[PDB]
Write an enzyme that holds these catalytic residues in place. Structure first.
Site, PDB file in Angstrom:
ATOM      1  N   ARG A   1       9.547  -1.989  -5.687  1.00 49.23           N
ATOM      2  CA  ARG A   1       8.155  -2.341  -5.883  1.00 49.23           C
ATOM      3  C   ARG A   1       7.458  -1.187  -6.586  1.00 49.23           C
ATOM      4  O   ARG A   1       7.607  -0.032  -6.173  1.00 49.23           O
ATOM      5  CB  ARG A   1       7.513  -2.637  -4.531  1.00 49.23           C
ATOM      6  CG  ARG A   1       6.072  -3.043  -4.577  1.00 49.23           C
ATOM      7  CD  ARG A   1       5.483  -2.845  -3.213  1.00 49.23           C
ATOM      8  NE  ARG A   1       4.057  -3.131  -3.165  1.00 49.23           N
ATOM      9  CZ  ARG A   1       3.359  -3.114  -2.040  1.00 49.23           C
ATOM     10  NH1 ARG A   1       3.929  -2.816  -0.878  1.00 49.23           N
ATOM     11  NH2 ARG A   1       2.064  -3.402  -2.076  1.00 49.23           N
ATOM     12  N   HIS A   2       6.723  -1.498  -7.655  1.00 55.28           N
ATOM     13  CA  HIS A   2       6.041  -0.473  -8.444  1.00 55.28           C
ATOM     14  C   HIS A   2       4.987   0.260  -7.612  1.00 55.28           C
ATOM     15  O   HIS A   2       4.494  -0.239  -6.607  1.00 55.28           O
ATOM     16  CB  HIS A   2       5.357  -1.093  -9.650  1.00 55.28           C
ATOM     17  CG  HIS A   2       4.259  -2.044  -9.281  1.00 55.28           C
ATOM     18  ND1 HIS A   2       2.995  -1.619  -8.923  1.00 55.28           N
ATOM     19  CD2 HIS A   2       4.246  -3.397  -9.184  1.00 55.28           C
ATOM     20  CE1 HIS A   2       2.247  -2.672  -8.637  1.00 55.28           C
ATOM     21  NE2 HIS A   2       2.977  -3.763  -8.797  1.00 55.28           N
TER      22      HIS A   2
ATOM     23  N   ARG B   1       3.072  -2.884 -15.157  1.00 51.53           N
ATOM     24  CA  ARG B   1       3.358  -1.941 -14.076  1.00 51.53           C
ATOM     25  C   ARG B   1       4.787  -2.129 -13.556  1.00 51.53           C
ATOM     26  O   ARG B   1       5.521  -1.146 -13.344  1.00 51.53           O
ATOM     27  CB  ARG B   1       2.314  -2.034 -12.959  1.00 51.53           C
ATOM     28  CG  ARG B   1       2.088  -3.365 -12.255  1.00 51.53           C
ATOM     29  CD  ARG B   1       0.699  -3.274 -11.602  1.00 51.53           C
ATOM     30  NE  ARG B   1       0.285  -4.431 -10.815  1.00 51.53           N
ATOM     31  CZ  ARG B   1      -0.450  -5.432 -11.283  1.00 51.53           C
ATOM     32  NH1 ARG B   1      -0.780  -5.516 -12.569  1.00 51.53           N
ATOM     33  NH2 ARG B   1      -0.871  -6.374 -10.445  1.00 51.53           N
TER      34      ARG B   1
ATOM     35  N   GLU C   1       2.731 -10.500  -9.836  1.00 54.06           N
ATOM     36  CA  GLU C   1       1.908 -10.297  -8.659  1.00 54.06           C
ATOM     37  C   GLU C   1       1.174 -11.585  -8.291  1.00 54.06           C
ATOM     38  O   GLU C   1       1.043 -12.519  -9.090  1.00 54.06           O
ATOM     39  CB  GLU C   1       0.903  -9.167  -8.916  1.00 54.06           C
ATOM     40  CG  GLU C   1       0.019  -8.766  -7.733  1.00 54.06           C
ATOM     41  CD  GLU C   1       0.830  -8.332  -6.502  1.00 54.06           C
ATOM     42  OE1 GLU C   1       1.305  -9.209  -5.755  1.00 54.06           O
ATOM     43  OE2 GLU C   1       0.999  -7.112  -6.284  1.00 54.06           O
TER      44      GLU C   1
ATOM     45  N   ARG D   1      -5.705 -12.666   7.075  1.00 56.04           N
ATOM     46  CA  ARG D   1      -4.810 -13.116   8.129  1.00 56.04           C
ATOM     47  C   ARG D   1      -4.150 -14.470   7.840  1.00 56.04           C
ATOM     48  O   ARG D   1      -3.524 -15.041   8.740  1.00 56.04           O
ATOM     49  CB  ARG D   1      -5.574 -13.184   9.457  1.00 56.04           C
ATOM     50  CG  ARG D   1      -6.547 -14.360   9.566  1.00 56.04           C
ATOM     51  CD  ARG D   1      -6.942 -14.682  11.023  1.00 56.04           C
ATOM     52  NE  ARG D   1      -7.503 -13.536  11.736  1.00 56.04           N
ATOM     53  CZ  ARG D   1      -8.777 -13.422  12.098  1.00 56.04           C
ATOM     54  NH1 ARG D   1      -9.665 -14.363  11.812  1.00 56.04           N
ATOM     55  NH2 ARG D   1      -9.170 -12.333  12.754  1.00 56.04           N
TER      56      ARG D   1
ATOM     57  N   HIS E   1       6.759  -7.041  -7.759  1.00 54.11           N
ATOM     58  CA  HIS E   1       5.509  -6.782  -7.066  1.00 54.11           C
ATOM     59  C   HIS E   1       5.639  -7.109  -5.586  1.00 54.11           C
ATOM     60  O   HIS E   1       6.505  -7.885  -5.172  1.00 54.11           O
ATOM     61  CB  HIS E   1       4.359  -7.601  -7.684  1.00 54.11           C
ATOM     62  CG  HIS E   1       4.241  -7.429  -9.166  1.00 54.11           C
ATOM     63  ND1 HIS E   1       3.414  -6.488  -9.743  1.00 54.11           N
ATOM     64  CD2 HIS E   1       4.865  -8.060 -10.192  1.00 54.11           C
ATOM     65  CE1 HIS E   1       3.526  -6.557 -11.058  1.00 54.11           C
ATOM     66  NE2 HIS E   1       4.395  -7.505 -11.359  1.00 54.11           N
ATOM     67  N   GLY E   2       4.732  -6.522  -4.800  1.00 54.80           N
ATOM     68  CA  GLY E   2       4.789  -6.690  -3.357  1.00 54.80           C
ATOM     69  C   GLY E   2       4.832  -8.141  -2.918  1.00 54.80           C
ATOM     70  O   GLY E   2       5.638  -8.515  -2.067  1.00 54.80           O
TER      71      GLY E   2
END
Ligand SMILES: [Cl-]
Lengths: 233, 237
Positions: free
Chosen positions: B9-10, B61, B88, B116, B185-186
């Site tokens: 992950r960047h 990124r 992302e 949440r 990405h995350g």
């Protein structure tokens, strides 16, 4: 009128030692890196856009392409890498300087090589210092026994580069995709000779500038409508 | 194992520096994010890792992280495949805002829901939005159907459009024995991890992957993980 763009990478680390690199994967020198930045800026200023990029499996070409795509903000473009755009395989001369080459092989053989389109250099023999470095590199594992050179004349280089042109680059151009090719003097020489129908002696007299976008305008038959042009000031 | 899979992950982006939501905005790595990618590539060098094909998003990124890694491990020659499906998560109308503007405009109740919740989208990005033409009118998305181009994404949306790429383009490569690196990405990597580990919506929303860290998976013949994910590097990190 299709637009095609070629760029030849700049000075390498082995140029700084005046060593034949060929398929040895020398990185760009700091100054060759700067050349690629300038070529990039020149494509940025002119507003050039691409849809697909081709390059070799050698990092001086790849880093030139990366630098250009950074400069033109097209880092997202598809990139295709092929050994068929590599530099000419200089066989046993790989790693030697010119003095070492003349001492080993003679001023006679040297003049023959400098003038000849189809006389290869000596093969890279298994006892060669860079034999494992190059001919046992993973990136070539898919090549058959007959495809992996031990040495290449200009004719050999062109004969293995043009199949990639016809097989993967021509279809993209036919579809309207705007192509950028970042590679090396000798493989790009093959592309130029085929586009312009040049003679052997002609192509061996042609010396492509480095770090400079080379622009081709092609007709519907992919024949150049005019000589190549350059981008910059 | 049967297979090794590496994800990365960047690091920090230019808009993390202004605490603005990036999403599909094509923010570049900050200098620290670039440095992190250098450290991860070094950790791959030192462990002697090898790859045969690289996947990444169409965002610079991620791409630049991948380039830096390939540089460090002397594998710039590897085939690279880019796809919007590793992009992302698209933060819709929140793109460009910071935290405080988001709370002022949308309210505490709404951000509390948004933090949440696995499947509540942010507001769509409408044509009046300041980054609508920059993102939605980028020629790089011009080949997406109308239904594929998102104006916003819940996490479930991101995972839903990431998993088909994993299944059709990545999994065949893994099963061919090719050693895969994924620089993304995350939220897209979250999709891959949730599918690999069979994690619940709850567990995946509590999982934050470290940035700049090579994430190593050992997978069996069925691409089931045989142990927990491993991070490569100095214990310090
Ligand atoms: Cl690339």
């Amino acid at each position: 009128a299709y637009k095609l763009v070629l760029i030849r990478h700049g000075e390498s680390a082995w140029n700084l030692e005046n060593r034949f690199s060929g398929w040895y994967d020398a990185d760009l020198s700091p100054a060759g890196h700067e050349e690629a930045k300038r070529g990039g800026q020149a494509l940025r200023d002119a507003g050039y856009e691409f849809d697909i990029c081709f390059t070799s499996v050698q990092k001086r070409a790849i880093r030139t392409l990366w630098t250009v795509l950074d400069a033109i903000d097209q880092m997202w473009l598809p990139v295709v890498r092929t050994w068929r755009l590599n530099e000419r395989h200089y066989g046993g001369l790989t790693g030697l300087n010119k003095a070492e080459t003349a001492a080993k092989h003679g001023e006679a053989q040297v003049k023959i090589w400098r003038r000849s389109y189809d006389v290869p250099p000596p093969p890279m023999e298994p006892d060669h210092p860079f034999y494992s470095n190059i001919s046992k590199d993973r990136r070539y594992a898919d090549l058959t026994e007959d495809q992996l050179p031990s040495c290449e004349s200009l004719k050999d280089t062109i004969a293995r580069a043009l199949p990639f042109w016809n097989e993967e680059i021509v279809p993209q151009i036919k579809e309207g995709k705007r192509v950028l090719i970042a590679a090396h003097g000798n493989s790009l020489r093959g592309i130029v000779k085929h586009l312009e129908g040049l003679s052997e002696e002609a192509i061996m007299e042609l010396n492509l500038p480095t770090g400079i976008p080379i622009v081709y305008e092609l007709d519907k038959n992919l024949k150049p409508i005019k000589p190549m042009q350059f981008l910059g000031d």
